[PDB]
Amino acid sequence: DGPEKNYEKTMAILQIEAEKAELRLKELEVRRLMRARGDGPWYQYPTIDKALIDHSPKTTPDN
Amino acid sequence: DSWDKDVYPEPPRRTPAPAPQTSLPNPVTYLTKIFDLLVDRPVTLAREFIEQQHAKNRYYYYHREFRRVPDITECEEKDILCMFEAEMQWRRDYKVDQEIVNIIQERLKACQQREGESYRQNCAKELEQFTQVSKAFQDRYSDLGAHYSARKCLAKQKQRMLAERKAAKEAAA
Structure with missing residues:
Protein backbone atom coordinates (compact mmCIF):
# COMPACT_ATOMS: atom_id res chain seq x y z
CA ASP A 1 0.00 0.00 0.00
CA GLY A 2 1.00 3.63 -0.33
CA PRO A 3 3.04 5.65 2.16
CA GLU A 4 -0.11 7.57 3.12
CA LYS A 5 -1.36 4.32 4.65
CA ASN A 6 1.45 4.28 7.21
CA TYR A 7 1.39 8.06 7.60
CA GLU A 8 -2.28 8.34 8.59
CA LYS A 9 -2.15 5.14 10.65
CA THR A 10 0.82 6.50 12.61
CA MET A 11 -1.02 9.80 13.08
CA ALA A 12 -3.96 7.98 14.65
CA ILE A 13 -1.80 5.68 16.78
CA LEU A 14 0.42 8.51 18.04
CA GLN A 15 -2.55 10.70 18.94
CA ILE A 16 -4.33 7.87 20.78
CA GLU A 17 -1.24 6.85 22.75
CA ALA A 18 -0.32 10.44 23.67
CA GLU A 19 -3.86 10.91 24.97
CA LYS A 20 -3.44 7.71 26.99
CA ALA A 21 -0.12 8.94 28.39
CA GLU A 22 -1.22 12.32 29.68
CA LEU A 23 -4.49 10.79 30.89
CA ARG A 24 -2.39 8.41 32.99
CA LEU A 25 -0.39 11.35 34.35
CA LYS A 26 -3.63 13.17 35.20
CA GLU A 27 -4.84 9.98 36.89
CA LEU A 28 -1.75 9.84 39.10
CA GLU A 29 -2.02 13.52 40.05
CA VAL A 30 -5.77 13.31 40.73
CA ARG A 31 -5.30 10.22 42.89
CA ARG A 32 -2.59 11.99 44.90
CA LEU A 33 -4.79 15.06 45.43
CA MET A 34 -7.89 13.07 46.38
CA ARG A 35 -5.99 10.88 48.83
CA ALA A 36 -4.29 13.92 50.36
CA ARG A 37 -7.42 16.07 50.79
CA GLY A 38 -10.44 13.80 50.36
CA ASP A 39 -12.58 16.52 48.74
CA GLY A 40 -13.58 14.20 45.93
CA PRO A 41 -15.97 11.47 44.81
CA TRP A 42 -13.64 8.58 45.70
CA TYR A 43 -11.16 7.88 48.52
CA GLN A 44 -13.98 8.64 50.96
CA TYR A 45 -13.74 6.78 54.24
CA PRO A 46 -16.62 5.42 56.34
CA THR A 47 -18.00 7.61 59.12
CA ILE A 48 -20.84 7.10 61.56
CA ASP A 49 -24.22 7.90 60.03
CA LYS A 50 -26.22 10.56 61.86
CA ALA A 51 -29.63 8.89 61.48
CA ASP A 62 -29.21 18.15 80.20
CA ASN A 63 -27.86 15.12 78.35
CA ASP B 1 22.81 10.59 -22.02
CA SER B 2 20.94 10.58 -18.72
CA TRP B 3 22.64 13.26 -16.58
CA ASP B 4 23.05 17.00 -17.03
CA LYS B 5 26.42 18.71 -16.98
CA ASP B 6 24.84 20.83 -14.24
CA VAL B 7 24.27 17.81 -11.99
CA TYR B 8 27.35 15.84 -13.13
CA PRO B 9 30.03 18.05 -14.70
CA GLU B 10 32.13 16.29 -17.33
CA PRO B 11 35.34 17.78 -18.75
CA PRO B 12 35.19 18.03 -22.55
CA ARG B 13 36.22 14.75 -24.17
CA ARG B 14 39.27 15.44 -26.36
CA THR B 15 41.23 12.63 -28.01
CA PRO B 16 44.42 12.93 -30.08
CA ALA B 17 44.81 11.53 -33.60
CA PRO B 18 48.18 9.75 -33.90
CA ALA B 19 49.75 9.25 -37.32
CA PRO B 20 51.39 5.80 -37.53
CA GLN B 21 54.25 6.99 -39.74
CA THR B 22 56.12 3.71 -39.20
CA SER B 23 55.75 1.02 -41.85
CA LEU B 24 54.62 -1.30 -39.05
CA PRO B 25 50.86 -0.74 -38.60
CA ASN B 26 49.44 -0.74 -35.09
CA PRO B 27 47.56 -3.98 -34.26
CA VAL B 28 45.07 -2.43 -31.86
CA THR B 29 43.42 -0.98 -34.96
CA TYR B 30 42.53 -4.41 -36.35
CA LEU B 31 41.35 -5.37 -32.87
CA THR B 32 38.92 -2.43 -32.80
CA LYS B 33 37.60 -3.28 -36.27
CA ILE B 34 37.02 -6.98 -35.61
CA PHE B 35 35.46 -6.23 -32.21
CA ASP B 36 33.11 -3.74 -33.89
CA LEU B 37 32.15 -6.20 -36.63
CA LEU B 38 31.41 -9.42 -34.77
CA VAL B 39 30.46 -8.08 -31.33
CA ASP B 40 29.24 -4.47 -31.46
CA ARG B 41 26.98 -4.89 -34.50
CA PRO B 42 25.07 -7.98 -33.22
CA VAL B 43 24.59 -6.55 -29.73
CA THR B 44 23.36 -3.32 -31.33
CA LEU B 45 20.83 -5.08 -33.56
CA ALA B 46 19.55 -7.24 -30.68
CA ARG B 47 19.30 -4.02 -28.67
CA GLU B 48 17.27 -2.45 -31.48
CA PHE B 49 14.93 -5.45 -31.41
CA ILE B 50 14.35 -5.26 -27.66
CA GLU B 51 14.18 -1.44 -27.73
CA GLN B 52 11.41 -1.39 -30.32
CA GLN B 53 9.72 -4.07 -28.21
CA HIS B 54 10.06 -1.75 -25.20
CA ALA B 55 8.70 1.20 -27.20
CA LYS B 56 5.73 -0.97 -28.19
CA ASN B 57 4.45 -0.58 -24.60
CA ARG B 58 6.12 2.03 -22.38
CA TYR B 59 4.23 2.39 -19.10
CA TYR B 60 4.81 5.63 -17.24
CA TYR B 61 5.94 6.63 -13.76
CA TYR B 62 6.76 9.91 -12.04
CA HIS B 63 8.60 11.32 -9.06
CA ARG B 64 7.03 11.11 -5.60
CA GLU B 65 6.09 14.64 -4.60
CA PHE B 66 6.47 15.71 -0.97
CA ARG B 67 4.43 18.68 0.22
CA ARG B 68 6.44 20.58 2.81
CA VAL B 69 5.27 20.55 6.43
CA PRO B 70 6.06 22.85 9.37
CA ASP B 71 9.54 22.38 10.80
CA ILE B 72 10.45 21.19 14.29
CA THR B 73 11.42 24.74 15.27
CA GLU B 74 7.83 25.75 14.47
CA CYS B 75 6.59 22.52 16.05
CA GLU B 76 5.33 22.95 19.60
CA GLU B 77 6.80 21.31 22.68
CA LYS B 78 5.38 17.78 22.94
CA ASP B 79 2.80 17.93 20.15
CA ILE B 80 2.97 14.44 18.67
CA LEU B 81 1.23 15.21 15.36
CA CYS B 82 3.38 18.11 14.18
CA MET B 83 6.34 16.38 15.83
CA PHE B 84 5.80 13.39 13.54
CA GLU B 85 5.41 15.68 10.52
CA ALA B 86 8.64 17.55 11.25
CA GLU B 87 10.55 14.37 12.10
CA MET B 88 9.65 12.72 8.80
CA GLN B 89 10.39 15.92 6.86
CA TRP B 90 13.78 16.21 8.57
CA ARG B 91 14.52 12.53 7.96
CA ARG B 92 13.88 12.91 4.24
CA ASP B 93 15.95 16.12 4.21
CA TYR B 94 18.79 14.16 5.85
CA LYS B 95 18.40 11.48 3.17
CA VAL B 96 18.50 14.09 0.40
CA ASP B 97 21.61 15.69 1.94
CA GLN B 98 23.29 12.28 2.18
CA GLU B 99 22.59 11.86 -1.52
CA ILE B 100 23.96 15.39 -2.08
CA VAL B 101 27.32 14.47 -0.57
CA ASN B 102 27.19 11.15 -2.45
CA ILE B 103 26.69 13.03 -5.74
CA ILE B 104 29.59 15.36 -4.97
CA GLN B 105 31.82 12.41 -4.08
CA GLU B 106 30.97 10.68 -7.37
CA ARG B 107 31.60 13.89 -9.33
CA LEU B 108 34.98 14.49 -7.73
CA LYS B 109 36.10 10.86 -8.09
CA ALA B 110 35.17 11.22 -11.76
CA CYS B 111 37.26 14.42 -11.86
CA GLN B 112 40.23 12.55 -10.41
CA GLN B 113 39.95 9.82 -13.03
CA ARG B 114 39.62 12.28 -15.94
CA GLU B 115 42.66 14.30 -14.88
CA GLY B 116 44.69 11.16 -14.13
CA GLU B 117 48.18 11.97 -12.88
CA SER B 118 47.26 15.69 -12.93
CA TYR B 119 44.41 15.07 -10.46
CA ARG B 120 46.06 17.35 -7.90
CA GLN B 121 46.33 20.17 -10.45
CA ASN B 122 42.89 19.77 -12.05
CA CYS B 123 40.53 18.73 -9.23
CA ALA B 124 40.91 21.49 -6.61
CA LYS B 125 37.88 23.31 -8.05
CA GLU B 126 35.63 20.43 -7.02
CA LEU B 127 37.93 19.45 -4.13
CA GLU B 128 37.03 22.65 -2.30
CA GLN B 129 33.35 22.05 -3.14
CA PHE B 130 33.39 18.60 -1.56
CA THR B 131 35.42 20.06 1.31
CA GLN B 132 32.79 22.68 2.16
CA VAL B 133 29.99 20.15 1.61
CA SER B 134 31.50 17.74 4.14
CA LYS B 135 32.57 20.50 6.56
CA ALA B 136 29.06 21.92 6.79
CA PHE B 137 27.51 18.43 6.72
CA GLN B 138 29.45 17.74 9.92
CA ASP B 139 27.87 20.68 11.75
CA ARG B 140 24.47 20.04 10.13
CA TYR B 141 23.94 16.30 10.70
CA SER B 142 26.98 14.57 12.23
CA ASP B 143 27.51 13.68 15.91
CA LEU B 144 23.75 13.18 16.34
CA GLY B 145 24.02 9.59 17.61
CA ALA B 146 22.28 6.40 16.55
CA HIS B 147 18.90 7.75 17.72
CA TYR B 148 19.28 10.99 15.75
CA SER B 149 16.06 13.00 15.52
CA ALA B 150 14.82 16.42 14.45
CA ARG B 151 14.90 17.64 18.06
CA LYS B 152 18.52 16.53 18.47
CA CYS B 153 19.49 18.24 15.21
CA LEU B 154 17.74 21.41 16.38
CA ALA B 155 19.57 21.19 19.72
CA LYS B 156 22.97 20.84 18.01
CA GLN B 157 22.12 23.70 15.64
CA LYS B 158 21.04 25.89 18.56
CA GLN B 159 24.24 25.12 20.48
CA ARG B 160 26.28 26.11 17.42
CA MET B 161 24.32 29.37 17.11
CA LEU B 162 24.86 30.31 20.76
CA ALA B 163 28.56 29.48 20.39
CA GLU B 164 29.01 31.65 17.30
CA ARG B 165 26.88 34.49 18.69
CA LYS B 166 28.85 34.59 21.94
CA ALA B 167 32.20 34.35 20.14
CA ALA B 168 31.34 37.16 17.72
CA LYS B 169 29.98 39.31 20.55
CA GLU B 170 33.08 38.93 22.73
CA ALA B 171 35.59 39.22 19.88
CA ALA B 172 34.03 42.30 18.24
CA ALA B 173 33.45 44.19 21.51
Missing part, protein backbone atom coordinates in the same frame (compact mmCIF):
# COMPACT_ATOMS: atom_id res chain seq x y z
CA LEU A 52 -28.62 6.38 64.17
CA ILE A 53 -28.60 9.24 66.70
CA ASP A 54 -31.70 9.38 68.89
CA HIS A 55 -33.09 12.80 69.81
CA SER A 56 -36.01 11.85 72.08
CA PRO A 57 -36.09 13.46 75.55
CA LYS A 58 -34.04 11.25 77.86
CA THR A 59 -34.35 10.77 81.62
CA THR A 60 -31.52 13.20 82.36
CA PRO A 61 -32.60 16.65 81.09
Whole structure:
Protein backbone atom coordinates (compact mmCIF):
# COMPACT_ATOMS: atom_id res chain seq x y z
CA ASP A 1 0.00 0.00 0.00
CA GLY A 2 1.00 3.63 -0.33
CA PRO A 3 3.04 5.65 2.16
CA GLU A 4 -0.11 7.57 3.12
CA LYS A 5 -1.36 4.32 4.65
CA ASN A 6 1.45 4.28 7.21
CA TYR A 7 1.39 8.06 7.60
CA GLU A 8 -2.28 8.34 8.59
CA LYS A 9 -2.15 5.14 10.65
CA THR A 10 0.82 6.50 12.61
CA MET A 11 -1.02 9.80 13.08
CA ALA A 12 -3.96 7.98 14.65
CA ILE A 13 -1.80 5.68 16.78
CA LEU A 14 0.42 8.51 18.04
CA GLN A 15 -2.55 10.70 18.94
CA ILE A 16 -4.33 7.87 20.78
CA GLU A 17 -1.24 6.85 22.75
CA ALA A 18 -0.32 10.44 23.67
CA GLU A 19 -3.86 10.91 24.97
CA LYS A 20 -3.44 7.71 26.99
CA ALA A 21 -0.12 8.94 28.39
CA GLU A 22 -1.22 12.32 29.68
CA LEU A 23 -4.49 10.79 30.89
CA ARG A 24 -2.39 8.41 32.99
CA LEU A 25 -0.39 11.35 34.35
CA LYS A 26 -3.63 13.17 35.20
CA GLU A 27 -4.84 9.98 36.89
CA LEU A 28 -1.75 9.84 39.10
CA GLU A 29 -2.02 13.52 40.05
CA VAL A 30 -5.77 13.31 40.73
CA ARG A 31 -5.30 10.22 42.89
CA ARG A 32 -2.59 11.99 44.90
CA LEU A 33 -4.79 15.06 45.43
CA MET A 34 -7.89 13.07 46.38
CA ARG A 35 -5.99 10.88 48.83
CA ALA A 36 -4.29 13.92 50.36
CA ARG A 37 -7.42 16.07 50.79
CA GLY A 38 -10.44 13.80 50.36
CA ASP A 39 -12.58 16.52 48.74
CA GLY A 40 -13.58 14.20 45.93
CA PRO A 41 -15.97 11.47 44.81
CA TRP A 42 -13.64 8.58 45.70
CA TYR A 43 -11.16 7.88 48.52
CA GLN A 44 -13.98 8.64 50.96
CA TYR A 45 -13.74 6.78 54.24
CA PRO A 46 -16.62 5.42 56.34
CA THR A 47 -18.00 7.61 59.12
CA ILE A 48 -20.84 7.10 61.56
CA ASP A 49 -24.22 7.90 60.03
CA LYS A 50 -26.22 10.56 61.86
CA ALA A 51 -29.63 8.89 61.48
CA LEU A 52 -28.62 6.38 64.17
CA ILE A 53 -28.60 9.24 66.70
CA ASP A 54 -31.70 9.38 68.89
CA HIS A 55 -33.09 12.80 69.81
CA SER A 56 -36.01 11.85 72.08
CA PRO A 57 -36.09 13.46 75.55
CA LYS A 58 -34.04 11.25 77.86
CA THR A 59 -34.35 10.77 81.62
CA THR A 60 -31.52 13.20 82.36
CA PRO A 61 -32.60 16.65 81.09
CA ASP A 62 -29.21 18.15 80.20
CA ASN A 63 -27.86 15.12 78.35
CA ASP B 1 22.81 10.59 -22.02
CA SER B 2 20.94 10.58 -18.72
CA TRP B 3 22.64 13.26 -16.58
CA ASP B 4 23.05 17.00 -17.03
CA LYS B 5 26.42 18.71 -16.98
CA ASP B 6 24.84 20.83 -14.24
CA VAL B 7 24.27 17.81 -11.99
CA TYR B 8 27.35 15.84 -13.13
CA PRO B 9 30.03 18.05 -14.70
CA GLU B 10 32.13 16.29 -17.33
CA PRO B 11 35.34 17.78 -18.75
CA PRO B 12 35.19 18.03 -22.55
CA ARG B 13 36.22 14.75 -24.17
CA ARG B 14 39.27 15.44 -26.36
CA THR B 15 41.23 12.63 -28.01
CA PRO B 16 44.42 12.93 -30.08
CA ALA B 17 44.81 11.53 -33.60
CA PRO B 18 48.18 9.75 -33.90
CA ALA B 19 49.75 9.25 -37.32
CA PRO B 20 51.39 5.80 -37.53
CA GLN B 21 54.25 6.99 -39.74
CA THR B 22 56.12 3.71 -39.20
CA SER B 23 55.75 1.02 -41.85
CA LEU B 24 54.62 -1.30 -39.05
CA PRO B 25 50.86 -0.74 -38.60
CA ASN B 26 49.44 -0.74 -35.09
CA PRO B 27 47.56 -3.98 -34.26
CA VAL B 28 45.07 -2.43 -31.86
CA THR B 29 43.42 -0.98 -34.96
CA TYR B 30 42.53 -4.41 -36.35
CA LEU B 31 41.35 -5.37 -32.87
CA THR B 32 38.92 -2.43 -32.80
CA LYS B 33 37.60 -3.28 -36.27
CA ILE B 34 37.02 -6.98 -35.61
CA PHE B 35 35.46 -6.23 -32.21
CA ASP B 36 33.11 -3.74 -33.89
CA LEU B 37 32.15 -6.20 -36.63
CA LEU B 38 31.41 -9.42 -34.77
CA VAL B 39 30.46 -8.08 -31.33
CA ASP B 40 29.24 -4.47 -31.46
CA ARG B 41 26.98 -4.89 -34.50
CA PRO B 42 25.07 -7.98 -33.22
CA VAL B 43 24.59 -6.55 -29.73
CA THR B 44 23.36 -3.32 -31.33
CA LEU B 45 20.83 -5.08 -33.56
CA ALA B 46 19.55 -7.24 -30.68
CA ARG B 47 19.30 -4.02 -28.67
CA GLU B 48 17.27 -2.45 -31.48
CA PHE B 49 14.93 -5.45 -31.41
CA ILE B 50 14.35 -5.26 -27.66
CA GLU B 51 14.18 -1.44 -27.73
CA GLN B 52 11.41 -1.39 -30.32
CA GLN B 53 9.72 -4.07 -28.21
CA HIS B 54 10.06 -1.75 -25.20
CA ALA B 55 8.70 1.20 -27.20
CA LYS B 56 5.73 -0.97 -28.19
CA ASN B 57 4.45 -0.58 -24.60
CA ARG B 58 6.12 2.03 -22.38
CA TYR B 59 4.23 2.39 -19.10
CA TYR B 60 4.81 5.63 -17.24
CA TYR B 61 5.94 6.63 -13.76
CA TYR B 62 6.76 9.91 -12.04
CA HIS B 63 8.60 11.32 -9.06
CA ARG B 64 7.03 11.11 -5.60
CA GLU B 65 6.09 14.64 -4.60
CA PHE B 66 6.47 15.71 -0.97
CA ARG B 67 4.43 18.68 0.22
CA ARG B 68 6.44 20.58 2.81
CA VAL B 69 5.27 20.55 6.43
CA PRO B 70 6.06 22.85 9.37
CA ASP B 71 9.54 22.38 10.80
CA ILE B 72 10.45 21.19 14.29
CA THR B 73 11.42 24.74 15.27
CA GLU B 74 7.83 25.75 14.47
CA CYS B 75 6.59 22.52 16.05
CA GLU B 76 5.33 22.95 19.60
CA GLU B 77 6.80 21.31 22.68
CA LYS B 78 5.38 17.78 22.94
CA ASP B 79 2.80 17.93 20.15
CA ILE B 80 2.97 14.44 18.67
CA LEU B 81 1.23 15.21 15.36
CA CYS B 82 3.38 18.11 14.18
CA MET B 83 6.34 16.38 15.83
CA PHE B 84 5.80 13.39 13.54
CA GLU B 85 5.41 15.68 10.52
CA ALA B 86 8.64 17.55 11.25
CA GLU B 87 10.55 14.37 12.10
CA MET B 88 9.65 12.72 8.80
CA GLN B 89 10.39 15.92 6.86
CA TRP B 90 13.78 16.21 8.57
CA ARG B 91 14.52 12.53 7.96
CA ARG B 92 13.88 12.91 4.24
CA ASP B 93 15.95 16.12 4.21
CA TYR B 94 18.79 14.16 5.85
CA LYS B 95 18.40 11.48 3.17
CA VAL B 96 18.50 14.09 0.40
CA ASP B 97 21.61 15.69 1.94
CA GLN B 98 23.29 12.28 2.18
CA GLU B 99 22.59 11.86 -1.52
CA ILE B 100 23.96 15.39 -2.08
CA VAL B 101 27.32 14.47 -0.57
CA ASN B 102 27.19 11.15 -2.45
CA ILE B 103 26.69 13.03 -5.74
CA ILE B 104 29.59 15.36 -4.97
CA GLN B 105 31.82 12.41 -4.08
CA GLU B 106 30.97 10.68 -7.37
CA ARG B 107 31.60 13.89 -9.33
CA LEU B 108 34.98 14.49 -7.73
CA LYS B 109 36.10 10.86 -8.09
CA ALA B 110 35.17 11.22 -11.76
CA CYS B 111 37.26 14.42 -11.86
CA GLN B 112 40.23 12.55 -10.41
CA GLN B 113 39.95 9.82 -13.03
CA ARG B 114 39.62 12.28 -15.94
CA GLU B 115 42.66 14.30 -14.88
CA GLY B 116 44.69 11.16 -14.13
CA GLU B 117 48.18 11.97 -12.88
CA SER B 118 47.26 15.69 -12.93
CA TYR B 119 44.41 15.07 -10.46
CA ARG B 120 46.06 17.35 -7.90
CA GLN B 121 46.33 20.17 -10.45
CA ASN B 122 42.89 19.77 -12.05
CA CYS B 123 40.53 18.73 -9.23
CA ALA B 124 40.91 21.49 -6.61
CA LYS B 125 37.88 23.31 -8.05
CA GLU B 126 35.63 20.43 -7.02
CA LEU B 127 37.93 19.45 -4.13
CA GLU B 128 37.03 22.65 -2.30
CA GLN B 129 33.35 22.05 -3.14
CA PHE B 130 33.39 18.60 -1.56
CA THR B 131 35.42 20.06 1.31
CA GLN B 132 32.79 22.68 2.16
CA VAL B 133 29.99 20.15 1.61
CA SER B 134 31.50 17.74 4.14
CA LYS B 135 32.57 20.50 6.56
CA ALA B 136 29.06 21.92 6.79
CA PHE B 137 27.51 18.43 6.72
CA GLN B 138 29.45 17.74 9.92
CA ASP B 139 27.87 20.68 11.75
CA ARG B 140 24.47 20.04 10.13
CA TYR B 141 23.94 16.30 10.70
CA SER B 142 26.98 14.57 12.23
CA ASP B 143 27.51 13.68 15.91
CA LEU B 144 23.75 13.18 16.34
CA GLY B 145 24.02 9.59 17.61
CA ALA B 146 22.28 6.40 16.55
CA HIS B 147 18.90 7.75 17.72
CA TYR B 148 19.28 10.99 15.75
CA SER B 149 16.06 13.00 15.52
CA ALA B 150 14.82 16.42 14.45
CA ARG B 151 14.90 17.64 18.06
CA LYS B 152 18.52 16.53 18.47
CA CYS B 153 19.49 18.24 15.21
CA LEU B 154 17.74 21.41 16.38
CA ALA B 155 19.57 21.19 19.72
CA LYS B 156 22.97 20.84 18.01
CA GLN B 157 22.12 23.70 15.64
CA LYS B 158 21.04 25.89 18.56
CA GLN B 159 24.24 25.12 20.48
CA ARG B 160 26.28 26.11 17.42
CA MET B 161 24.32 29.37 17.11
CA LEU B 162 24.86 30.31 20.76
CA ALA B 163 28.56 29.48 20.39
CA GLU B 164 29.01 31.65 17.30
CA ARG B 165 26.88 34.49 18.69
CA LYS B 166 28.85 34.59 21.94
CA ALA B 167 32.20 34.35 20.14
CA ALA B 168 31.34 37.16 17.72
CA LYS B 169 29.98 39.31 20.55
CA GLU B 170 33.08 38.93 22.73
CA ALA B 171 35.59 39.22 19.88
CA ALA B 172 34.03 42.30 18.24
CA ALA B 173 33.45 44.19 21.51
